Ligand SMILES: CNC(=O)c1cc(Oc2ccc(NC(=O)Nc3ccc(Cl)c(C(F)(F)F)c3)cc2)ccn1
């Protein structure tokens with residue numbers, strides 16, 4: 264009862280993207296599927312250890328808001344097959360084609376991003392890289408979370424929590440760490456913009472956010488953004504680690520201050 | 527890994543349905559989820575063996591057209607938690623509220639029902655009970671397959687039952703082919719929007735005639751525009767002889783092909 268797919272099965276289709284550590288190929292296997300090819304020339308030792316994780320950690324998840332894992336493949340290049348998702352990433356929606364989401368929808372995109380994340384931590388899985396770019400809106404409804412990146416190892420700083428920018432310890436990452444990100448994703452949803460937008464200089468934003476001199480200008484949340492939300496938003500972006508809430512509490516908040524809206 | 531969910535987590539919500547061997551409770555666990563409660567008074571020996579199957583067989587599947595398995599629960603009653611699906615079952619759509627599906631859609635609902643089934647057999651999992659009632663159209667798009675029944679001691683409905691099964695051979699009548707025949711009826715449903723043997727008002731008979739080969743779905747009901755390429759396949763499946771029906775790898779390919787050719 265394992266999940267290795269014998270080679271010569273997954274009909275590697277066309278290309279989707281490719282970078283530093285990977286290539287995604289929209290393929291075929293009992294249905295449309297995304298196949299992430301890792302190696303090429305040959306498989307590397309450090310590399311191989313990576314694969315054994317993005318998998319062991321994927322197969323441990325099984326929830327409707329997290330990118331489904333179909334199986335892996337040692338054969339012709341290490342390969343991870345995950346359901347193909349039609350549509351585009353949150354980041355694309357908000358900052359590229361600038362779609363205008365009705366408010367209710369926004370609150371729910373968050374709601375789901377919350378459930379997903381709340382599940383990932385239950386299984387004791389720290390994402391280490393949540394961001395609007397990893398929030399995929401499947402079929403334009405239903406948030407699918409995954410690490411759709413390819414220039415990492417396991418970068419992008421806007422969703423990076425202060426402690427992480429500083430790196431004081433060895434393991435800056437933690438459940439809290441992830442929330443801060445969710446905090447920025449939330450801030451995104453409600454203002455429809457990225458943070459530090461006026462500062463045109465990567466090095467600086469990195470430094471100020473690290474020293475506590477910089478923080479998202481919460482005075483941009485939409486006119487109608489629930490006061491109950493903006494509250495929580497700030498509750499997460501808290502610069503102090505242990506002052507941010509876990510997700511069981513986050514989810515409940517959003518959900519509550521949700522049933523009181525459609526009218 | 528292990529998918530047992532410690533008790534006191536899945537917030538058992540309201541009721542959804544209940545029968546002979548089960549009760550479904552729309553609950554809560556990191557999100558809306560369906561929880562199938564098996565026992566009550568206490569867990570039975572014959573019962574317990576059942577649970578160990580509907581699970582061992584569920585966790586073995588992992589595909590977008592098959593009802594997602596979230597986890598199980600030995601605690602307060604044996605319980606199987608699967609993603610909740612909003613919407614309704616195919617059977618409901620076609621024969622209860624009688625929605626009128628554009629044709630293209632119908633061909634695709636089948637397309638997916640095909641992919642799902644094609645995956646289930648790959649993992650060497652015979653469904654033993656496919657029917658429009660187990661084909662759930664999630665969010666009104668995306669077929670989710672599962673055994674949404676509760677009056678049959680799992681891992682009562684003859685219309686989708688293939689001849690050999692009605693008769694019963696040696697010990698085990700069920701097989702990949704067996705499942706196709708069902709898919710054949712689900713297809714026949716999709717294209718005529720009706721159930722088979724509709725004019726015969728007598729369960730015992732239908733059972734008998736379908737068994738002896740005297741009865742068969744009246745393929746002359748497929749909609750005016752039903753692709754000739756389809757009706758063909760439909761009949762290809764409903765074949766009364768077992769070994770004359772096609773496996774699913776071939777079925778899927780057929781539908782898919784005779785699909786891309788009709789939009790422009
Ligand atoms: C526009 N292109 C698309 O259409 C499209 C592309 C796809 O390509 C992909 C294929 C595979 C993946 N691999 C990850 O997701 N892996 C992951 C790593 C760590 C961790 Cl921690 C997790 C986590 F958090 F989920 F568990 C997940 C991502 C995207 C899929 C569906 N659609």
Ligand SMILES: CNC(=O)c1cc(Oc2ccc(NC(=O)Nc3ccc(Cl)c(C(F)(F)F)c3)cc2)ccn1
Pocket residue numbers: 542550560561562580583584587592593606608609610611612613646651652653671672673674675680681
């Ligand atoms: C209207 N109510 C709903 O909204 C709703 C209800 C639900 O209730 C359910 C809860 C649990 C199940 N148990 C099965 O599914 N077990 C199964 C057995 C063998 C085999 Cl072979 C398979 C197979 F094929 F899928 F793998 C699946 C079915 C339905 C779920 C989502 N939504």
